[PDB]
Amino acid sequence: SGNFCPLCDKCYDDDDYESKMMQCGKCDRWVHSKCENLSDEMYEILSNLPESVAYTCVNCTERHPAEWRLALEKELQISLKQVLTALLNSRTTSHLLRYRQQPLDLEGVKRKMDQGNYTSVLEFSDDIVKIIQAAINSDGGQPEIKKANSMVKSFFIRQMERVFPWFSVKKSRFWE
């Protein structure tokens, strides 16, 4: 009916799905997300990798870094970049946000992205929400600007929900 996590030795029931754990494809043991030093974001992303990418515990992993760790790292960057290129390639948003005049604009977001400094979906989305909301606060009551900013806002939210279904973009602290 159960066993113990091979790392922390806490017990678990085979039928208890109210936990955050991964099951090793080789020994069948379950390991806590925390025991692999995985954040909640990474656990969600891991849950979405292809079935062909098996999780393997520390005991059953013969080659380090484990294949799932490589796939997870790449999947995160790919997913983030996906959203960023879609914005950079969007005429309207690029127009209004890529170049302005800590990321002050989408170009700043890219430099950060390229330097490999983005790990958190929350931080990435927050940086973009800040840029969008900043444009909105300075619409100047100009109606064509508002319509435009409202459109890039919905576009961003849709891009985020599709790439990161488990993430609440609408809850961002930076929306006003």
């Binding site: 494809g25 891991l46 799932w68």
Partner: peptide
Amino acid sequence: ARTKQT
């Protein structure tokens, strides 16, 4: 990768 969510 199999998780409790999978």
